[PDB]
Amino acid sequence: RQLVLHYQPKVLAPNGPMIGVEALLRWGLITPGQFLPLAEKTGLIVQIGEWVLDEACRQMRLWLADWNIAVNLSALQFAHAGLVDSVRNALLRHSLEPSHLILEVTESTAMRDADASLVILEQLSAMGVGISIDDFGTGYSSLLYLKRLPASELKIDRGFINELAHDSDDAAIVSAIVALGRTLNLKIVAEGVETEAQQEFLTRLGCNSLQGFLLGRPMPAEQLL
Amino acid sequence: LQLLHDLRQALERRQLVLHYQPKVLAPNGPMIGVEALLRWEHPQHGLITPGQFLPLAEKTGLIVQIGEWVLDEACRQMRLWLDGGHADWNIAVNLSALQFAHAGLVDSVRNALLRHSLEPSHLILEVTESTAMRDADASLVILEQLSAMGVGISIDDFGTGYSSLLYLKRLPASELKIDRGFINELAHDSDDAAIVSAIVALGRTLNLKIVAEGVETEAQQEFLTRLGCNSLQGFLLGRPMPAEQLL
Ligand SMILES: Nc1nc2c(ncn2[C@@H]2O[C@@H]3COP(=O)(O)O[C@H]4[C@@H](O)[C@H](n5cnc6c(=O)[nH]c(N)nc65)O[C@@H]4COP(=O)(O)O[C@H]3[C@H]2O)c(=O)[nH]1
Ligand SMILES: Nc1nc2c(ncn2[C@@H]2O[C@@H]3COP(=O)(O)O[C@H]4[C@@H](O)[C@H](n5cnc6c(=O)[nH]c(N)nc65)O[C@@H]4COP(=O)(O)O[C@H]3[C@H]2O)c(=O)[nH]1
Ligand SMILES: [Mg+2]
Ligand SMILES: [Mg+2]
Ligand SMILES: [Mg+2]
Ligand SMILES: [Mg+2]
């Protein structure tokens, strides 16, 4: 068992309290960018995912701790026939309210076969699980399906969060995502917040919550305290 | 289902209208505003009341655009009235639980006031006790924004939910509205008069105006006045009616 979760805080804007964490997988000390693609191609991602989901639910129970936890799903995990049985079973196993668990799938993953995403996410949403669309702005979305999917939040891609000059293309895109949130009834999370000016500007643009190194780096449950 | 199809097209068919009910200083003092109340003029069923279709609207999400239309028309009407010289009237608009939690609520209020050049102090937003107290920390963030814009905040159907006195003081509410259920039962239950008195006393000690709602009889009016209610609303003082008929 060399697999460990690190947790990164999500924080209500403007400076408001921490409302939850994202679980981030780690393995020397190996980062997931170095091995998740091999796991995806080989199918080992599905067992690793079962372990991640279980450990996140276990940790949340242990804490419960007035907050929720977000787990990432790769394209294979999202499409895997077992996914929805397994989410329901993991919440049942730990007697954990479904409102405490968030599942993140990327824009690309969700939009690849939107009708199939809809069958899967509708089940998940009827069970009460929070559904987040990650890396938003980096894929291709149908506005029609963006409304139809029972998502509760979009997470702005880290790639748009750099110098964020007021007249930048990046700022326009952040504004557009915020406006999608406002018109489609979705919370918007900015990810990759490293500086005070980003925090301030993203808050004024109307992001609902923030994640990034400035607010807290990923760390193991113990160090998080 | 017929109701579902019919409600979907109700805005397209201009079948939705606002009626307005006077709120009056107690006992019968000047009218200080109105509550906007949605009605549906149905070509087959006639004038349908919102208890008969707002739950379907909530469940389907049709309540969002129905609410945009309600807010727009209410703001239009208040503007018109202000320009007609009714300087001391406000208008109160109801918010369901879904509208109160909608990510765009505050932007939509700001846009509607700007569209009709309406000072924010002439708009009152009513959220029920239950709605406000379900997640009080979240209610606080929402209501503080609305209150900083200058919009009045009313806690509706008061007495029907469960309130934290702590958050009841922290919320930037301006008024509590006693639920009509407590007014109607006064002649038929000894507990109701105590409950109504307690609500009035909460207003007095937390610095909130109290509105008594559902006033139908002279004796209710007299009793509520003697208790010290600030304002009254009810059939005795004036039923909901269209803006024109109200005059
Ligand atoms: N430069 C910078 N980076 C920041 C900042 N704040 C957070 N990050 C990093 O950005 C990534 C956020 O996760 P992601 O976009 O979902 O993207 C994740 C996610 O797609 C994938 N991944 C991580 N854990 C899991 C997992 O348990 N399951 C699955 N299926 N995928 C995972 O690996 C990707 C990269 O993971 P990480 O290395 O942990 O990198 C994490 C996080 O450490 C910041 O302020 N500045
Ligand atoms: N028996 C009796 N009833 C009286 C008397 N005085 C006032 N009422 C009624 O009490 C209700 C007061 O509104 P509410 O408690 O906010 O309760 C409202 C409110 O929750 C909701 N509603 C109405 N319009 C709207 C709207 O535009 N948006 C939203 N979200 N909800 C609305 O529907 C509920 C019922 O609306 P209405 O049928 O118009 O019923 C109205 C009004 O007609 C009286 O003396 N006797
Ligand atoms: Mg993620
Ligand atoms: Mg991301
Ligand atoms: Mg009301
Ligand atoms: Mg009421």
Residue numbers in the entry:
A (entry chain B): 448 to 474, 480 to 516, 521 to 681
B (entry chain A): 435 to 681
What does the paper behind this entry write?
DGC domains containing the signature GGDEF motif synthesise c-di-GMP from two GTP molecules while EAL1516 and HD-GYP171819 domain-containing PDEs are responsible for the hydrolysis of c-di-GMP to 5′-phosphoguanylyl-(3′-5′)-guanosine (pGpG). Hydrolysis of c-di-GMP by EAL domains has been shown to require the presence of divalent ions, either Mg2+ or Mn2+, with the most efficient reactions occurring at alkaline pH2933. Here we report as yet structurally uncharacterised EAL domains from the core genome of Pseudomonas aeruginosa, PA1727 (MucR) and PA3825.
